[PDB]
Design a binder for this molecule. Structure first.
Ligand SMILES: CC(=O)N[C@H]1[C@H]([C@H](O)[C@H](O)CO)O[C@@](O[C@@H]2[C@@H](O)[C@H](O)O[C@H](CO)[C@@H]2O)(C(=O)O)C[C@@H]1O
Ligand SMILES: [Ca+2]
Ligand SMILES: [Ca+2]
Ligand SMILES: [Ca+2]
Ligand SMILES: [Ca+2]
Ligand SMILES: [Ca+2]
Ligand SMILES: [Ca+2]
Ligand SMILES: [Ca+2]
Lengths: 200, 193
């Protein structure tokens, strides 16, 4: 029987972390140690500061005997919100943060940093608007105020899954813009939104 | 023998707003106590206001038009939403005449009445919304624009539901009424940092 614990904790990372700007997300690390106890973790940029102040996790159940067995792993909930204005470069391949995690057991053994990747995307990547019920108008090239109100309400009614803080605007010819809270957009062409009342 | 025509009181300030139903009353009296009928015209010529209507309830009945209880003729209508408004507001009106007669056939002279009409923004005056706090005064977010619109709407249930409230980058609010006239609420009454 081995006199001392010389083996560091083992960490399982989520494989496909995807976050949308302005929306709360969460993911879990799973950690075990041959001793059954994990003391704490470190999120870093390969040993350097994490540099992501919006990322957080609970230290609940840290450094408790039996908190990290094979049958009952330590489950660390990481969560936060990618800032609304977080820059997305021209190549969306680049809209991600590669970071590292490691963990200590209660015997001074620390694991070697392993990577996880937080991919972040514009809100319109998450949302796909359904077409509204058609609004019938007097002039296709010049909607009235009530007709624009109606169009907005129709687009809203057809899409309850879309954020309430998204703003729906309507042009003179019934073209619909949905601007999500992160200012990314979806467009609905007028021919899918309005029809001439007299012709119909 | 009745030889004297009825007398007619008209409202002094008939003011109608485009697309919105108005109502007013004529009050008519005759010495006999009875008024037979009235006629609305353009100084005797056709009235030419097909959107105007009046009630003929209680016409030509004894005692329908006494000094104490005059004949009260309800007039109502809706000036067309797209009725053109002259640059000179003194011409934004219809000048018409009413005459009335008793059962003896004594007819009054043509009495003038004027229906003034105005854009819907001449009626509506938006109330202050609760202030919306924003991150950047010169560049509102979609969420903040939504909040601004919501607040303006909540403060103004008297403004037509069909009116459209828009919000610019700096929180300036535009209210566009059904007849396409507008009101503006300056940013300073709407947003704060
Ligand atoms: C939005 C953006 O530019 N994202 C980058 C990201 C950032 O540069 C950084 O992580 C935030 O401080 O960095 C990515 O690249 C890393 C390299 O900078 C590092 O030298 O090597 C890493 C190797 O795993 C990694 O490639 C990232 O975090 O994936 C690239 C990403 O587009
Ligand atoms: Ca160990
Ligand atoms: Ca989309
Ligand atoms: Ca008389
Ligand atoms: Ca009476
Ligand atoms: Ca006004
Ligand atoms: Ca006024
Ligand atoms: Ca709206």
């Amino acid at each position: 029987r081995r006199a001392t614990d010389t083996t560091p904790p083992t960490i399982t990372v989520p494989s496909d972390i995807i976050a949308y700007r302005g929306e709360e997300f969460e993911f879990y690390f799973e950690i075990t140690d041959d001793s059954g106890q994990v003391k704490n973790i470190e999120l870093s940029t390969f040993g350097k500061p994490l540099g992501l102040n919006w990322l957080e996790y609970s230290e609940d159940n840290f450094n408790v005997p039996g908190n990290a067995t094979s049958d009952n792993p330590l489950r660390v909930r990481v969560h936060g919100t990618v800032p609304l204005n977080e820059p997305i470069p021209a190549d969306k391949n680049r809209a991600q943060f590669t970071r590292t995690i490691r963990a200590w057991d209660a015997a001074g053994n620390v694991s070697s940093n392993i990577t996880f990747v937080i991919k972040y995307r514009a809100q319109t990547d998450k949302y796909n608007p359904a077409d509204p019920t058609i609004t019938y108008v007097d002039r296709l090239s010049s909607l009235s105020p009530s007709e624009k109100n109606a169009v907005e309400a129709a687009v809203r009614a057809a899409n309850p899954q879309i954020p309430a803080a998204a703003r729906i605007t309507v042009s003179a010819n019934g073209t619909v813009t949905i601007t999500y809270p992160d200012s990314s957009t979806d467009t609905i062409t007028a021919n899918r939104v309005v029809k001439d009342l007299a012709s119909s």
